[PDB]
């Protein structure tokens, strides 16, 4: 078995224009390659064919071949490296925003990155492209959770997306800016990426000061500078919460919580998770329904 | 009367579901694609969908373009989408990945029939809501006789099982209340909603002006009697079947040089079974289709072959189509 | 009002000593286990 | 080497199960009957059974004799029985009628696969016991690709479900003992017996010297690639498939007067896909079968057509068989 | 629609020799007949075709057409009459003892007789032929329960079968005759057909006295005559049990039960059922497992 | 032995008066509801 004429037929079909017969022939050749335990040839063949079909504006064949490539990745035990990640990054780049199963292929690549790497949620370099591609496809809530665990460029794109989302809203009602800034603070405080949280806060507050015209006062002490607003107390609460989480002390957290009682009530889940993560506060365990019935009745 | 063409079905403005079934390779996929293409050509104001309920799908091979679990428009046709029901196995995040908002049962036999019924439920729900993509008609490229029969009989089984479960729940009401905790989930309400949805599905599936079955077959003993058994089973389910597509006919008498011993003895057998079919189903739309000089694949080839569903195939005059189709 | 004085006092007390965790701390993504509770969806909608 | 005939399978003294599958009317029933007839002719000391697992059975039509849920000898053949698995519904006394010694689940989709597996279990139990009728080999006339794939994948699903149920039972041992009454039924023992039986079935179904799969197909795009997908799925299940039967070949070049324009363009397409098949499966027993001048029905006709499984069909010399077969 | 050519083709196929094509054509014609709500034509057509296929020594086609005829019987609401029963009796007569699904067709005919008649178990005239046909097929235990609810000829055939079964056993061990006679007494006492029980007892005891040579004494009083054996006390116990069940008095039953303690223990189920049926003895109710657990534990 | 005397006495007492149910009583099969417990299978095998 050499697959000489089969590969020649695949090339002739892909050049002539009949792309589905070429896709089926490519799947046949890849089946023979994987069967013969030759994973390198299959990997390059499938990747090149998927790229060629995605360049031809054909979502179905290219996406099916990406799924085949991910199956070969899983079966061949391919680790997360620069070349292996770039192989998927090229396919993401050639993918279409209007792909009906864009989320499926994105999830497949992310799952492969999870399984074959030390990261518990995926390779940050892969996440940087995944989030942008999902944003192009109007998956903003799904694309925010990918910029969260990305690189520095992912943080920049997350800040840009949040700023554009805020600018697209005509009204303000002194609640929009707080609701946008809370996501930026909390998402980057959950993973304890406080450097990224501080930089994103600086960028967002500078953009807010530029586009809008509120009353700001730079309270700077010891090296730490916090902007102060009169009407927009939520921004001050979020900045002070970031500072308190930075210093990791219980007394400051208690003072902030019992001062800003209304906002602590509004964000109860976020503050209790932050206390559990940072201040070693033992949050109550999950209230399982069966256990609750057994304890309360049995 | 009963003209030998599907013109009444093609230009019908009331049909919502159109099942195409038969016996194992008589042309279910080709004829379903042909019916869908003819309908979408004759009704440019309505969007048509073509689902492949065969667990080994062949819509992509017939159309020369890959289709998936989700509706995808056919290239060159602006009012015809094609979908091939994937056996679930939807990709899910391995870890939490909290976006701001088992598998063994997928391997159980008969899962594809349940998935097809779930797709039907989703489509009727969408039509009731009128949101997202709206498909005014859905044509099914069904599995062979036994499995499409099981698919069509599934609504009755589901309704009976739902009735039994509701009866058991009503009997055990006090007992389940005393046994279960403080759950506020309305089991009876959801059960009744599911029963109403299944009853609406059954009402649409037994309405002669809303659904129909087209039985494709070839004129041979096994295929003819398999079609007879399938039609009997459909009539048992009370589903309107009044069209038959006799496929792969040689027409070796009124052609140019079809004088090859085998391509003539086969036509003698086919004509005998055609006479039997015409004797049996005198009130059916018996559409006679030819055997072309090659496989019927591609949108242009499928359209050229489908042009004989609207108008009856005349082998004396329309004899060059089967040779311009290789 | 009094909120300015409270903010100033809180900042002075917090920045009296260098915090235990550095200003530019970045926990590696390899060691992150939980992402926390999901944030609530916004009442608006991206268009772009 | 790989000769283009099933002689290795026909004269094999070790094979116990032989599945024949393919794509929807390529000749699964005809080729399964042919394989069974050739095996029973070449091995007169062994009794062979031919089960039809297709829910719309066609063994009776092919053999010209009615077969039922129970094994019935083929007339004129003293070592070949044929059985068509009826979908249960066994007749039971309406009232007590105490001789001295539900139905809804029968309508659930996928019931026929479960019944076929139960028949396989009964046959392996009988072979272990060696009582009653003993069938040394069983040939399956399976359903089309998807449903025969579900049938063959059923043992793995059943084994996984049995393992999960046993794990749950072991976990709840004290709890079920404290909850249930004084029942002395050994749930663990019966579960282990069922697991052992299913494991023996799986071991026999993944043994290259005990079971095999014969993939019948016609040389066309849809059929060829359906066969490719089916072979890939079988290899995934680790089931020995090494024979392919390319069926309904015109052989319009090396024949007498096969100059019919169509019977020649169709042969050009068939030869192209034959070259593709020979390129793909170089290590398979690719048996090329002709298209006869009529349907292959009846024991004599099936035997005459099956004679080409033992020896490769030579269209130059064996050209009068397809015309003596109408 | 006239089905002229279809019927002509069915006749030509059945005359030529191709019986399966004729069977399929007949099924087609019967489908068209039943669809057109013409049940008489379908009934005669199916019955005649099934008879023709059974005469041709073809079990499969004839049996399938018998099942079709029973389906038409159920769907057309055909009552149990002389003609309707004779229609099935002819098919039973032409049936083969070696039919693989003889029990299935027998059960179908019996179920139809149950559903469309006042009898709770079937028409006795049908049972007379059903039992004989089942006996021909070596279903003796199943053929005994049909002679039980048959006609007088059914009782005669039941006695003959029991006598032949006893004669076929080489040994006696003074337990064979008792075990054979107990069935004859109890089966005809359960349905309270005491006249048949007495006649069968007379025939069996006369045959026993003829073929064997035991010590018998005719104790005859008031008109009732009972044979007495010395060694074979079981026959005396069975005769006295029949007499006691005839007189329907509790005192005689108690005397017989506490005299023949061993045989009462051996046949405990039979005596307690006889007491419940005849002497208005309230037998204990069924010990349901769930109810037993609920009462004993809950 | 004494069994002869017991049988004679039992027969005389039973046949002192005409039994309530006639000698040739035949309950119609239409009114029969229960066939009773199944009889035990014999340790032989009819083979003719
Ligand atoms: N009228 C025709 N003339 C020539 N070729 C035909 C004709 N109808 C169908 N074919 C071809 O015959 C082959 C089998 O037909 P098809 O794929 O439609 O079968 P099917 O009914 O979908 O089968 P299955 O039951 O396996 O799903 C295909 O290659 C198809 O292109
Ligand atoms: N080589 C052949 N030459 C001529 N006719 C053939 C040949 N093989 C099969 N046939 C005929 O073609 C028809 C379809 O074949 P067959 O009944 O074997 O299909 P199948 O694979 O069992 O289909 P299904 O998937 O519906 O069960 C039958 O009438 C059969 O007699
Ligand atoms: Mg198909
Ligand atoms: Mg078949
Ligand atoms: Zn020809």
Numbering used by the authors:
A (entry chain E), E (entry chain B): 11 to 308
B (entry chain A), D (entry chain D): 4 to 104, 127 to 351
C (entry chain F), F (entry chain C): 7 to 54
Article, verbatim:
Here, we report the 3.2 Å cryo-EM structure of the Saccharomyces cerevisiae Get3-Get4/5 complex, using full-length Get4/5 containing the Sgt2-binding domain. As previous studies have shown that ATP-bound Get3 exhibits the highest affinity for Get4/5 (22), we utilized the Get3(D57N) variant. Mutation of this residue has been previously shown to effectively trap Get3 in its ATP-bound state by allowing ATP binding without subsequent hydrolysis. Each Get3(D57N) monomer engages a Get4/5 heterodimer through three distinct interaction surfaces, mirrored symmetrically on the opposite side of the dimer, resulting in six contact points across the assembly. Key catalytic and nucleotide-coordinating elements in the ATPase domain, including P-loop residues K26, T32, and T33, as well as the catalytic residue D57 (mutated to N in this study), adopt conformations compatible with ATP binding and hydrolysis, indistinguishable from those observed in Get3 alone. In our structure, this region is unstructured and engaged by Get4/5, creating two lateral openings on opposite sides of the chamber that increase solvent and presumably substrate accessibility. At the same time, the apical surface of the TA-binding chamber, which is typically disordered and unresolved in structures lacking Get4/5, becomes more stable and interacts with a C-terminal α-helix from Get4 to form a composite lid over the chamber. In our cryo-EM structure of the yeast Get3-Get4/5 complex, we identified a consistent density feature adjacent to the lateral gate of Get3, extending from the last modeled C-terminal residue of Get5.
The Guided Entry of Tail-Anchored Proteins (GET) pathway ensures accurate targeting of Tail-Anchored proteins (TAs)—a diverse class of membrane proteins—to the endoplasmic reticulum (ER) membrane. Efficient and protected handoff of hydrophobic TAs from Sgt2 to Get3 is facilitated by the Get4/5 complex, which is thought to act as a scaffold to position TA-bound Sgt2 and Get3 in proximity while trapping Get3 in an ATP-bound conformation necessary for TA binding. For Get3 to receive the TA, it must adopt a closed, nucleotide-bound conformation, which forms a hydrophobic chamber capable of accommodating the TA's transmembrane domain.
